[PDB]
């Protein structure tokens, strides 16, 4: 799916792990009720691509943005293909 689009996704994940989850304290430790200065808020010149809420969560095989399932990491139609051939343990057509 437009290999460049998948390239963006991998770069976004790498940047997010590099910068945030360690500089996430920047918006947590300081942006609270200390007693303040705004210097911390203005210290958001980070790449802006490190924000975890900026990744699209694409399908692992095809890479389409829509119809995604978190449990399997695949889009709806790749899930159905794998389910019919086996692959996904314990998954079978449901009736009740």
């Amino acid at each position: 799916a437009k290999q460049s689009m998948k390239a963006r996704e991998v770069k976004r994940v790498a940047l997010a792990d590099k910068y945030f989850a360690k500089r996430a304290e920047l918006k947590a430790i300081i942006s609270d009720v200390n007693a303040r200065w705004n210097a911390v808020l203005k210290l958001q010149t980070l790449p802006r691509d490190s924000s975890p809420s900026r990744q699209r969560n694409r399908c692992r095989q095809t890479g389409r943005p829509h119809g995604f399932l978190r449990k399997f990491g695949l889009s709806r139609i790749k899930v159905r293909e794998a389910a019919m051939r086996g692959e996904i343990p314990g998954l079978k057509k449901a009736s009740w």
Binding site: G67, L69, K71, R76, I77, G90, L91, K93, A94
Partner: protein, 98 residues
């Protein structure tokens, strides 16, 4: 005292594992409260089957997780150890903790 609960995706395999766990504990120990079924978890999924439009055409799947509980009330020591190195598991998850 020491509890064993097993998780698997099919009952035919979970029951075999419990029978093995119970019998070995009896052989190397005593008592055993016996396997306890505990409720089964049914996770459902619903997905469109057409690559394009056709919203009303979709399949429904489920994953059924089976659970069991053993509980040996008083390890005879010769028990606990043997409870180890007795995996013979190929799809059944065993957590050894109390």
């Amino acid at each position: 005292r020491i509890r064993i609960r097993l998780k698997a995706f099919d009952h035919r395999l979970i029951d075999q594992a419990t029978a093995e766990i119970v019998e070995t504990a009896k052989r190397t120990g005593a008592q055993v409260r016996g396997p306890i079924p505990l409720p089964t978890r049914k996770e459902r999924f619903t997905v469109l089957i057409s690559p394009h439009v056709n919203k009303d055409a979709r399949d429904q799947y489920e994953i059924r997780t089976h659970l069991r509980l053993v509980d040996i009330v008083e390890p005879t020591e010769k028990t606990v150890d043997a409870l180890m190195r007795l995996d013979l598991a190929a799809g059944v998850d065993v957590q050894i903790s109390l």
